[model samples]
Target chain A: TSHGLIESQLSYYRARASEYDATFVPYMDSAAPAALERLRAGNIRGDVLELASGTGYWTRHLSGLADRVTALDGSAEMIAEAGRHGLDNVEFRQQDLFDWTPDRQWDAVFFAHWLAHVPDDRFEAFWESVRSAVAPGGVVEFVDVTDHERRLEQQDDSEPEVAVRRTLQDGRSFRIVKVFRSPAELTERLTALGWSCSVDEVHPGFLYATCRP
Target chain B: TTSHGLIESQLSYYRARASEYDATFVPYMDSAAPAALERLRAGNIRGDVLELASGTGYWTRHLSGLADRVTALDGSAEMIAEAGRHGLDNVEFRQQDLFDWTPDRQWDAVFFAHWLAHVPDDRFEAFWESVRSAVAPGGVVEFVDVTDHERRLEQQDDSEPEVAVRRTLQDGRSFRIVKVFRSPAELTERLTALGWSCSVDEVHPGFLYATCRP
Candidate 1:
């Protein structure tokens, strides 16, 4: 059943969940907290639904602002690590982002470092799900990596597949979906779907947006 | 037994009657509501709160000043938009169906007014289970509903207490909706059996209020 690239990506993330937190060295920089604080000061409100809440670095901040928070991820290990923080207002669920259907709408839907992982073919479908997850007049926010020089140099632009091989600490390697999208292009594409979105290049390797439908 | 289509019909009724919902809340519009709501605010309302079926945001606007934050959920987007028109800055309005929705996180306090009686009798325990799950450990729960006397007065020729009542909108469009009025003692006893310490009190002119803790 796990034959395709998406399944392989899932396998890679499941295996990498234990060491995933260590890979956020750049994300732990001063700019990261500043951006998060900026999000807190903004109009993000109510019960928040967070996708790909790996290790819950962002979940902790979201809990402080929201009345309630649902943090979900595909990997159980990632959810377990997020749970260890003991954030009282947050509820964690282990669910594949692609397969999980939201049974309820949220005031705000949020995700971090997960949008780029979606392959080009699934891009529309992914945004469709995001659209359904939000309530009328609700907002959506996400932060993802951009095509920075250091990261872009490693990715083969000429390859037809939007994926790259990632090596683990144990010398094991896996191919995962890692598409790079321009911030302006991403905003433009979503705008065509009737969403009022504005993506900002907050950090050299990261872009964030505060969008509403 | 009521037909299964009653729920759908009831939802249709609410959707059709969204614009006129605020006019029907006697407790909210009258003088008695202020005192009763004050009692609830002084004794029960605290911390982060969740309001289910927060139709038209009447209670939500009041709740905003009582709790640190209020997350108001309604099945009807029209109803939520009506509530949003009130311009209460402290409340967050979300549209979600109660039966299908899951409680993603616990709350410090949960409140629902004039909405509990609509739940189908068969799903009563399951509904309470969802409510209990939404309540954090050591949290409080409070609800208000019309008394059986009110239902008796409304359904004059009712046999065995009508499970479904037909409601009419301004355009005279009628839809069948659930309207089961409950007694204080019965509700108190049921909640007690469910492991919650609860007290239900009958308010004047056919209203019952209940407060509980696990």
Candidate 2:
């Protein structure tokens, strides 16, 4: 069961917030930049909410297109790093995504490398929450790592719970929930659940989707 | 049959049954109902609310305490009068068929119990579009209806997307009305397609409940 794992994952994100940016250096090479550029060219518009907005990497880019953007994260430390970027058009809120209800719907909701961390039991509820945050006819954009071997330690078993194990620079290890789903499967499931969307696997281990409901 | 014709007959059925309507829920009622109802009420009731087809004030009295204000709507003037008999100070009653009325403003929450089944399949999407328009930006929604097992009885007509069931009154007179039994999974998928985030749970074999954010 994923009973206590959510807390552990949040704790890991909070503790790793300071050193989190360094982990992205290798991923931000030519392939990553091109992917980001393609996402930017797609022009995600209107009011936006960025989930798990660690250090404002994508938040800064969202602010360029959205009239207003709410950058939300469960980790205060993660939001603190995002706050350091000091974007004027963005509002930052630190709260657990599960407990936080929407104050208002948004035109677009964006997330990067966040959906895989959600446990299977919580997937429908998670999407339900995501749906509630989006305004009528609004869109959702997400980019995530689809390759299971890209993490800190990769194993070859098919158990959903123990998909990934990550160790911090401080020598602490935490078991996190990571489900590597195929883009076609993701698109099919969402479509069956009533979303109009397309999910594509980009080169170099990235999955991206833009959806409407 | 045309949608209007079906709705007209459905309205007649409810109007004719309004006097004896409360008895229908007794056989299926359970001890767990109050607690489950309390949980549903506490979970979704917030700010101003609009309750549709609020026959006889069973739920209106419960909503009075949880919301700042409540507007209870019914197509039957007799039903509205029956609900008014409770004299809940926080609630205002309106008489209008859901199809004929347009909301003047948005509400923080919207609730309907045992009503969605009456909406014909052709009208389902349109009905939800109305619901979305009336709901405030971050408003909540809660609805309850009977389960699929209950619809299997009584030689139900399965020819059209909207099924007709013969409902009899105490006087042994009958009226045919539109009744579509939706599974929790189906409702969740349909509402999701219409751009609402929702979840449905079957509380008992005879009843299912849903909560949505629009």
Candidate 3:
């Protein structure tokens, strides 16, 4: 019931999914593509699993490198469009992160630009499900906007909350519930979880890390 | 008679078991608190220690003045709130998502209590990979969790008692809910690939610790 607003947002995004290629693709700068590249290089052993994979953007490229790729998303509409793409190596499933379980273990798991949607409370439950799907000795590649302090300031707090977003010449003005992690801090969290992590800059406003289990 | 065994059954199991999922080891903390304190008083904890998902400051409260820095995080709001209400000032608590948690810092020792078993299988690689990322070279990432495969078997109401039944079947089916069980050998292999040397020490029958380093 609480996720009604979020679900509605995703539903709208899915309906306007094609607009992603135009508006989002150009502006989708930073770690998503860069993280995908690192994971592809590290995971030469087997297939891959992509979580919260939207619009089949990264999946299309990963399908070339992986033996098989299972792209999972919470929105059925999101995957329904993904399924129409006719990619042989990729399979789509509608699954939420809190309850997600995979049929097969992959060499690496990839998630990009989708972390902030989760509320503060559900992180552990979401992670518990994520760790369950990872294969033994596998790795995971993640990319997201870690520096929320800068992003959050761009918003006008006085402005009413509406779906209407203002577009600027340089970028879009929007609000995201994000937090920042210096590369060093990101690495610490990874190592504490029993993964050897490596942090590298993927672009601006984003950071990428690959963790080996 | 569950035809679809992939996901529905797993969710049912977690929803059922969420109530009893207390991984804190509170009973031992009372008895074992002195030994931990002794280590601190004796200056056994030399440098900064990282506590992964340190829920409610169960261990952090004891190690407050011991380590140079105690960085703890948990996805649970209520648990972190409890930790704050307890006035654990030395420990820095933050709400970071484990899968997406990336910190830009290093520490001398990484102390992770019970976090892995709670991770769902799909995100395990990310969680494990996250741990591997932040561990300083030659630094230690000590982990504690339940490891007995037998318990996973006995906890189930199944008629079959075969050990092979407990092991992940060759067909890749049959698993427990909200928890993944592992033997030492399996964990060792995974750790080795991630560039960490692994050693498991049994503190009790089912409770154990895995100390790994680069």
Candidate 4:
């Protein structure tokens, strides 16, 4: 219940799953190439776990490098669309990550454009779950929104959650969590959490991070 | 991230003026400067202290002697080199641009002299937020910045003032930099609004120093 809009957000994503990739703005994903390059250079190998692998856009990429990728999403529609990508190495699972805990560890964990979607109050819990999912000596790689988007959005943290109302192309709308943590601030947050982290700009409105325990 | 141009210009000015900084500003330091330094000396600032914008190392010299360990950062490589010339064993220096910098860990005390004034108005909230994140529990955040009295002390107020003001180099070149001047009470109120219990005190009318905590 503290996540006031989580269900609404997933409903919108599920509703928009058919037009998901078709609705992207060029500037919104200008950093995708850079993020993929970062992912490749991260040397992610062996078992990889991907959280919120929406539409399997990133799942296909993860499949190319990892021996196996276990991708999770709450929306079966999103998972179904993701499954259409024909990534043979991926095991797509439809599950709500908010209430889930890791039953086992993975060699690597990755999330793309995901952290900003987390309600502000859930940041600590989400990161702790991520920590529990990584095996000993495992690395974590993630990429997400940054300053340019922040400059454009009105982020209110007066409440425990930081989110905004976003409308889809079909005139339907829903509220979603979004906050672009500054590079300095986010790095400090991750560092404080006991991971040696590297976060750098992936051009405007985007960033990539690597965390090692 | 707003007012990036002003912030970038300010960093460029500081980077270009590093060699002349100590000479240009040291003469205007006044007796109040020592009092502010002494104020920090009485600050109980210890246990892995962090220093920002340690230009040419004057405060770092005093800080190195006071804290258990000191990590000093400056944007200019030249400034970092000059700050390290003292070869003070207790202090480690890093050439880092503040906008892109992240603390390796929180510190018991965070100190910066003459740096806060250069922070553009648009970035004031975010800048302080970053400072808040870097400080540890029971830690202190102390800083010294220029006040408008220095505009008179330096006798260089020939042009109009904005948050971004014009500065002329010795070689007849001019550039714009952020140099917002505020009074102690006003700055205190500003910090108070940002959720800090902060006290800013005037230093001989030409400078101001503040001690704050969240």
- Please name the candidate that would achieve the greatest TM-score relative to the true structure: 4
Tens digit per residue, CA lDDT, model 2, B1-214:
3457767887987788777877764235443366459656665687899998898877788788788999899999888877778789999998888876678889998988878878877788878888888899878889877654321221121222325555667887766677666778778888999988887887765567888988
Candidate 4 C-alpha lDDT tens digits along A62-111? 89889999999989998989878888899989888788888999999998
Overall lDDT per candidate, in order of appearance: 0.75, 0.74, 0.58, 0.76
Candidate ranking under lDDT, highest first, comes to 4, 1, 2, 3
* TM-scores of all predicted structures: 0.47, 0.47, 0.41, 0.49
Per-prediction DockQ comes to: 0.01, 0.01, 0.01, 0.01
Across residues A98-137, which tens digit of lDDT does each residue of candidate 3 receive? Answer: 5565556777788876664554455556665666677888
Q: Comparing 2 and 3 by lDDT, which wins?
A: 2
Instruction: Tell me the TM-score for chain B of model 4.
Output: 0.87
Candidate 2 CAPRI grade: incorrect
Better of 2 and 3 by TM-score: 2
Least well predicted 10-residue stretch by lDDT in candidate 4 chain A: A149-158
How much does candidate 3 score in TM-score? 0.41
Model 4: pairs clashing at backbone N, Cα or C within 3 Å: none
In model 1, what are the clashing residue pairs, if there are any? none
Instruction: Give the lDDT of residue A98 in candidate 1.
Output: 73
The interface RMSD values of the models, given in order, are 33.9, 25.9, 26.2, 20.4
Clashes of 2: 0
Best candidate according to lDDT: 4
The digit string of per-residue lDDT tens for model 4 on B1-214 reads 3377777777787778887877666335655677787678775588889999998999888888888899898888988877778888999888888877656689999999878877766778878888889999999899887554212212211122335556666776576766666767768889999999987787554567889988
